[model samples]
Target chain A: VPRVAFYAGLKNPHEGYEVLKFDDVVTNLGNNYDAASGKFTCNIPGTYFFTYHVLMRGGDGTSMWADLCKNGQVRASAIAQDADQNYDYASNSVILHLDAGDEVFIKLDGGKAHGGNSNKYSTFSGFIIYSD
Target chain B: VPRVAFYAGLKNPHEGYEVLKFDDVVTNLGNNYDAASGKFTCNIPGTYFFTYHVLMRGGDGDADQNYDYASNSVILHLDAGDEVFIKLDGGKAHGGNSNKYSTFSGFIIYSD
Candidate 1:
């Protein structure tokens, strides 16, 4: 695929960075990514860009730990433990070189996740930066 | 036309009063982003998402560290929309020292 871009957000929180999922589909122009599974399927593949934003509330003693992964490998991570403030958010980005069908998704850092919220503040998105 | 995305880290540090710059580029897929100028140019007239992260350290020992601790910030210059200031204020104080991180990201919604 020479062109693709999609943006999705989580309406609720999910557990495990092993399989980060977003419930809302704000924009899915290419339909290459599945919002239900938080899996972005590379249709063409030369290079792709993906980004994630996370927010966690305080007073609940919840810690926020997450990673932007490629095939289960931690490419980059965003971490914010405890509510230094009433609430806080962390964001990270990554780019990947892929072949005809690679997969990408966000993974939560296990029980340490504390929790996450939605409303456009918490989201995961990506697109084909370029195709070879 | 194809959309593009870029993921980069700040190799060094920058000030909030200027156009934010990233020194190290972990990834620049489409070549749409110019690391040297610290700018992301739109190649196609379509919608795109842009996110930025800022990590600032505080320790001046001023009573007003509330805004200073939150002083870590940058601005986005857009051709299609009004320029937006990205502030990294956690609305709290750091340990009188150490670094605080702030992130910003957004989609074009539409562009020329």
Candidate 2:
């Protein structure tokens, strides 16, 4: 599985700094992402680019914060929020080195105030930028 | 082309609902994306990867409301209705960020 590439969207809608689970996989071209567990495993060692988005609609103080996590640490973050007629979103993207068995996914700022969606509104995806 | 990679950003600022286009290509190694069309058509057929970002500055540009009511959204569409989307929305009043302009990027994945 040298050519790792895939797209996965949130299978369910959510709120307030969650781990951002994805079940509705739109594309898993490399057969690496596990829609069942929402974890993407690498099959090759090289530079990889990963991005995630969080979409939300809040009537009572709505906020959106999403993070692109690698292995066990946070790589990048995105944040957005609204007070009046709140319609907002957040996202993150990064290109980093990933070895085989490395895992990646999205996580909400569970400590901070946030909330959100699925149906492609909230998505988690990754691809190989260059393989070694 | 065994390797494909690129990072493009919106050349000009935009507002009030637009299709985030990238004219500022930070990098394009395989020449897969067409900045003119804003569509990244795959030249090679293997599993390709893509990602996008939209940073908007939302405000009336007036004294009434500062950066209020703004949105930025994008999607990756492929054969078989396969797609992925990303969006960032912000602003209300007391010192908020931009909802006016932004950028996007993506590339093909691992290969021999």
Candidate 3:
């Protein structure tokens, strides 16, 4: 296994239908993930697994939706809704077959998210299960 | 390296310190995850990465800590036959066949 994997965490709160830039890159092997654009471009075609966890902000009636997108299509989605003026967590994971140049990323489908600290409340990660 | 991975999603809402039964088994490459019992018993000794996404029931709000949900991922060293599973604290997990909001997945990083 050559080990093509990347793990990153959001450094600040982001909202709306925007791409999340996980500036705090914990691991980025093979240089396939671009921190500036918040997207993972596949270079080695193979089966891959992607997962993410997003922390919803603590405020009056806060709710957020996040999706794991493959080439702009939603493969998995999670939601966190809170009315208690406290933080909430949502998560989802998926397995996909990717060809070279395929793009994958996390998008805020709606509402707001929380991050920016050592706790790493929001994160996205993926790795090749087995390269072709 | 012998590849091993599993992905499963919760089928119904459940609460308390109960082991979630992810009856919707999407991928179990090496037959390490048991769908009926909701446990991933390791067959090969190595380091593994495990992650879970659990959705809390909507419209449930309270100040008590027992009514809250959490999510996390971790890497662990395990021996052959070591078992892994997710147990909820007290809040109800929102999931169903139509909407898979709660899920659990794991894979072998390297076999020691």
TM-score for candidate 2, residues paired by index = 0.61
Of the two candidates 1 and 3, the one with more favorable DockQ, higher being better, is 3
Scored by CA lDDT, what does every candidate get?
0.58, 0.59, 0.79
Give the 10-residue window scoring lowest on summed lDDT in candidate 2 chain A: A110-119
Q: What is the alpha-carbon lDDT of model 2 when measured against the actual structure?
A: 0.59
TM-score of each: 0.58, 0.61, 0.74
Cα lDDT tens digits for candidate 3, B1-112: 7678887777777777888878778778778888888889988999998988776663524542232345678999999878898877666787766455677888888989
Highest-lDDT candidate? 3
Instruction: Evaluate model 3 with DockQ and give the value.
Output: 0.30
Write candidate 1's Cα lDDT for B1-112 as tens digits.
3544565544444544556544355566666665555666665556655655554444455343333212111112245333333333342222211122433333443344
Tell me the lDDT of model 3 at A55: 87
Task: List ranges where model 1 is wrong by over 4 Å.
Answer: A16-18, A83-85, A111-118, B1-45, B51-64, B67-112
Q: Write the per-residue lDDT of candidate 1 for residues A72-98, one digit (tens) a residue.
A: 577888777553544555567778887
